[PDB]
Amino acid sequence: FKTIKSDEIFAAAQKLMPGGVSSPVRAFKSVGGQPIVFDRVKDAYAWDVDGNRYIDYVGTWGPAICGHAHPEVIEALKVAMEKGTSFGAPCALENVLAEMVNDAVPSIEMVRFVNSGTEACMAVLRIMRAYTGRDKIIKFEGCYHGHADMFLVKAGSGVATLGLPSSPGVPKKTTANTLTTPYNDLEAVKALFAENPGEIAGVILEPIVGNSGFIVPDAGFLEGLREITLEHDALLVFDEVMTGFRIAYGGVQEKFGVTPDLTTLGKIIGGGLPVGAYGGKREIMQLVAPAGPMYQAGTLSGNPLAMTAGIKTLELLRQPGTYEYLDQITKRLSDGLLAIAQETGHAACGGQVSGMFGFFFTEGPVHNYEDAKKSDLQKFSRFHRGMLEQGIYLAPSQFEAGFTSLAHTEEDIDATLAAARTVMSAL
Amino acid sequence: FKTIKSDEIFAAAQKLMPGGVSSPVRAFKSVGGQPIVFDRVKDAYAWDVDGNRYIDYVGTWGPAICGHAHPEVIEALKVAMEKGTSFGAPCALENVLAEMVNDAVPSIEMVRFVNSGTEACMAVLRIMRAYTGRDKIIKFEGCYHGHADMFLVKAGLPSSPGVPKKTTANTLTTPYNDLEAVKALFAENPGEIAGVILEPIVGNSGFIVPDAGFLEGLREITLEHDALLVFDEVMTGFRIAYGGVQEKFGVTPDLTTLGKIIGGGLPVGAYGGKREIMQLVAPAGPMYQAGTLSGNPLAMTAGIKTLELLRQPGTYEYLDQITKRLSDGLLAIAQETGHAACGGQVSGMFGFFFTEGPVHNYEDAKKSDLQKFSRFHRGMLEQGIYLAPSQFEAGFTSLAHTEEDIDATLAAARTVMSAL
Numbered sequence: 001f002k003t004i005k006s007d008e009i010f011a012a013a014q015k016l017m018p019g020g021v022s023s024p025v026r027a028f029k030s031v032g033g034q035p036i037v038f039d040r041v042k043d044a045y046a047w048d049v050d051g052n053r054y055i056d057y058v059g060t061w062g063p064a065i066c067g068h069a070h071p072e073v074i075e076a077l078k079v080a081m082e083k084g085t086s087f088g089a090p091c092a093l094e095n096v097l098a099e100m101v102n103d104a105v106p107s108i109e110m111v112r113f114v115n116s117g118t119e120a121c122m123a124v125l126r127i128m129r130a131y132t133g134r135d136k137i138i139k140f141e142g143c144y145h146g147h148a149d150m151f152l153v154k155a156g157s158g159v160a161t162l163g164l165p166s167s168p169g170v171p172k173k174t175t176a177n178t179l180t181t182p183y184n185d186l187e188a189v190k191a192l193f194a195e196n197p198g199e200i201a202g203v204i205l206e207p208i209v210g211n212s213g214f215i216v217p218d219a220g221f222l223e224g225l226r227e228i229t230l231e232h233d234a235l236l237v238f239d240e241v242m243t244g245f246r247i248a249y250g251g252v253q254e255k256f257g258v259t260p261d262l263t264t265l266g267k268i269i270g271g272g273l274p275v276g277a278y279g280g281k282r283e284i285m286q287l288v289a290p291a292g293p294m295y296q297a298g299t300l301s302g303n304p305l306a307m308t309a310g311i312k313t314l315e316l317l318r319q320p321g322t323y324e325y326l327d328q329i330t331k332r333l334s335d336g337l338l339a340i341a342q343e344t345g346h347a348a349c350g351g352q353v354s355g356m357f358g359f360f361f362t363e364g365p366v367h368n369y370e371d372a373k374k375s376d377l378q379k380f381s382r383f384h385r386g387m388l389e390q391g392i393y394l395a396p397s398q399f400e401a402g403f404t405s406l407a408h409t410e411e412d413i414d415a416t417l418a419a420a421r422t423v424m425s426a427l
Numbered sequence: 428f429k430t431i432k433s434d435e436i437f438a439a440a441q442k443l444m445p446g447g448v449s450s451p452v453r454a455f456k457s458v459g460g461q462p463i464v465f466d467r468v469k470d471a472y473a474w475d476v477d478g479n480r481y482i483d484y485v486g487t488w489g490p491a492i493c494g495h496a497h498p499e500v501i502e503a504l505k506v507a508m509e510k511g512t513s514f515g516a517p518c519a520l521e522n523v524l525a526e527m528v529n530d531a532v533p534s535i536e537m538v539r540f541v542n543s544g545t546e547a548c549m550a551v552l553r554i555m556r557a558y559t560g561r562d563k564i565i566k567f568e569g570c571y572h573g574h575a576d577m578f579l580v581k582a583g584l585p586s587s588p589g590v591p592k593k594t595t596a597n598t599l600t601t602p603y604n605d606l607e608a609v610k611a612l613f614a615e616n617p618g619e620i621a622g623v624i625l626e627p628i629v630g631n632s633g634f635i636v637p638d639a640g641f642l643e644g645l646r647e648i649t650l651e652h653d654a655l656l657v658f659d660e661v662m663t664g665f666r667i668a669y670g671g672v673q674e675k676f677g678v679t680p681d682l683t684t685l686g687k688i689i690g691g692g693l694p695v696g697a698y699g700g701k702r703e704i705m706q707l708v709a710p711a712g713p714m715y716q717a718g719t720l721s722g723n724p725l726a727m728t729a730g731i732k733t734l735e736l737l738r739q740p741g742t743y744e745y746l747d748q749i750t751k752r753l754s755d756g757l758l759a760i761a762q763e764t765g766h767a768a769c770g771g772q773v774s775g776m777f778g779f780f781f782t783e784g785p786v787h788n789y790e791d792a793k794k795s796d797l798q799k800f801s802r803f804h805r806g807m808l809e810q811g812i813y814l815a816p817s818q819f820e821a822g823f824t825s826l827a828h829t830e831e832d833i834d835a836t837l838a839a840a841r842t843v844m845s846a847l
């Protein structure tokens with residue numbers, strides 16, 4: 001196993017871009033700092049600039065649910081780019097995706113497309129405060145909603161209400177209205193409300209966590225957050241940028257039967273192109289300009305290429321047995337990893353829902369970020385590297401959920417398990 | 428002039444998306460409220476869903492500088508997507524674009540690609556504060572830097588709902604082209620000013636050129652108070668000149684944001700400057716900023732190809748040539764038809780206000796006769812000309828715009844203004 005070309009390109013990148021990457025995690029600092037430079041991806045695989053081929057469990061972080069470079073998506077894109085990559089004006093494709101999004105996810109009756117999860121979340125945050133007239137927001141430790149200043153706050157016991165910025169360059173002023181609570185902790189949220197009567201605009205969260213490893217909501221958690229927000233006329237916002245169209249066609253809200261007031265979407269709805277969307281109830285979305293006073297603009301938003309890829313991707317997801325397959329192969333993968341971790345003597349816990357999964361090197365179970373933080377990062381680092389050496393590309397971080405696609409075959413899963421066995425036996 | 432299909436699609440859109448659009452301006456609220464739905468765009472044209480063709484002066488707001496759907500860009504795109512629409516990991520194409528950007532603009536030694544001007548600006552604002560360790564920012568009224576909260580300031584009070592005053596408190600604003608005001612701000616906030624951000628040439632409150640010495644003065648005082656100078660060239664970058672306004676006017680900022688053109692139509696953005704400052708950005712430094720789909724291979728591809736095209740000889744001279752003729756023509760026609768107007772142009776960027784002006788700032792811009800602009804806009808639309816649906820938006824030309832297109836556009840203007 002060698003990554004000479006990646007080493008070279010990455011080395012040169014360090015002089016051109018901060019850390020040699022467009023996004024922090026890509027720097028592999030959580031797992032050796034030796035990132036892989038991709039050349040191309042197809043179906044369930046990715047190819048190195050060195051020729052290395054991997055079974056991919058990142059799927060460009062969600063979008064590639066139907067597999068990398070799906071022929072139907074690229075075909076639809078070929079037609080779209082022919083008509084121009086961007087209009088800066090209304091196009092019929094926006095209506096189409098909008099309708100699909102509306103018909104697909106319960107809480108969405110109207111949507112505004114944007115260009116990233118970060119844009120979606122910062123806008124949805126602004127809308128929650130605009131609709132309620134309240135400034136305080138409740139987020140959960142371990143959840144990620146982009147890098148808007150409000151979200152860049154320190155979390156954990158002792159600073160849950162301190163609103164301390166967790167990054168230089170962000171005024172305490174801006175984080176002063178962001179409250180955090182442990183995921184899967186209803187009493188923690190009730191507490192935040194009581195401590196701030198009439199000030200909580202709402203609660204935002206990943207209905208199923210992927211940014212602190214894979215973490216599923218304990219029974220009654222989503223129901224509880226729904227009850228508590230309704231009781232205080234506060235808004236419940238599901239960040240389904242990652243879970244949207246992956247956990248289920250209707251996202252976690254559809255699968256678990258809990259309807260929020262607003263939800264953010266992304267990844268899949270763009271077919272690989274930068275995209276994002278924030279929608280929800282009609283009465284709330286009407287505040288978004290130019291229909292309402294809450295300002296939010298996106299010059300290249302509703303991009304025809306992004307809309308086309310999103311539409312084609314959803315049409316594919318609409319086909320029969322789609323999510324049943326993702327669930328099947330993924331459960332197989334997940335149970336396999338845990339069985340292998342057990343047989344090799346490694347403390348581990350994990351799970352999966354549809355085509356999304358997690359695997360922590362700790363006994364767990366993992367109900368929140370604090371639990372996740374107990375995972376053996378050194379072990380994970382060696383694990384990730386080993387899997388890489390075995391031709392398996394996993395998210396370069398213990399705190400990132402993995403992804404499967406309709407392209408992953410029964411054989412891919414088994415080759416992966418074989419590799420996992422080989423790697424864990426050597427850990 | 429029929430726009431039946433546009434109306435139908437738009438009406439249905441208003442039930443699916445706020446205002447029936449993905450971005451406020453597209454709703455045509457300032458010019459009648461009946462936007463035209465595009466089906467496709469080619470070269471210097473836009474084609475309606477009703478079969479109408481328009482000589483396009485919006486160029487999807489900047490990206491289409493080499494023309495809409497340029498064959499080489501679409502070909503480069505079709506070839507690149509075959510390898511994947513996105514990696515979510517490093518690819519050589521990022522190094523290439525980064526290098527072309529670094530070589531192109533005076534102040535950039537290191538760059539971080541993002542997905543929009545908004546992300547670029549909020550990120551640059553954060554780096555400004557992280558580098559200086561200060562929170563107060565100076566922005567100009569009439570300048571637009573995305574919808575990030577700190578920018579949604581009134582003129583540090585919120586200008587729209589949903590944004591806590593607490594976050595806009597650290598945002599100081601001043602009239603564009605007003606050095607004394609900026610100076611006063613620094614004095615009223617000693618040791619608290621992280622820096623100054625602005626569009627070196629304004630396009631978001633109409634086309635507004637900086638006065639002689641303005642940019643030079645801003646560089647001087649920021650240096651004096653150990654504060655950063657940030658050029659938001661998302662709109663001007665690679666348009667005013669290959670190196671943007673900073674190159675053309677010769678004033679070098681410490682940091683600059685980019686977008687539009689660098690993505691050839693695809694969602695894109697970037698911020699860069701001296702490596703000493705840029706090294707603060709994660710994962711190199713402690714300042715956090717991330718973008719899951721940033722450095723998109725398709726966006727890099729289209730940006731790389733778009734820049735290669737711009738690097739050809741006569742590119743900016745051509746833009747300047749046809750645009751000056753367009754701008755001069757408009758003002759001449761306005762004069763001969765008896766309408767107070769003022770405008771100007773620099774490269775393929777221009778403005779035309781229905782006000783005698785002068786227009787050195789937003790306040791001046793607001794003196795324009797919006798009613799007249801609206802009727803002008805509609806009439807031009809009927810004459811087969813598509814201008815920005817706002818008096819407060821600069822216009823754009825592209826390499827695809829022919830001498831004939833300009834002739835036709837001026838002829839149209841004559842007809843419209845003669846009817847105003």
Ligand SMILES: Cc1ncc(COP(=O)(O)O)c(CN)c1O
Pocket residue numbers: 116117118119121144145146147206210211239240241242266717718719720
């Ligand atoms: C749940 C969630 N919300 C928001 C974001 C921000 O996404 P982007 O990088 O597209 O801004 C992400 C991506 N990590 C996410 O996983």
Ligand SMILES: Cc1ncc(COP(=O)(O)O)c(CN)c1O
Pocket residue numbers: 297298299300543544545546548571572573574626630631659660661662663686
């Ligand atoms: C100078 C400038 N800065 C930032 C932006 C924000 O761009 P986007 O919609 O790409 O976020 C714009 C687009 N209006 C701009 O013109």
Ligand SMILES: NC[C@@H](N)CCC(=O)O
Pocket residue numbers: 141155156157182183368369370371
């Ligand atoms: N779910 C436990 C929280 N009180 C946070 C612990 C921490 O990370 O400090």
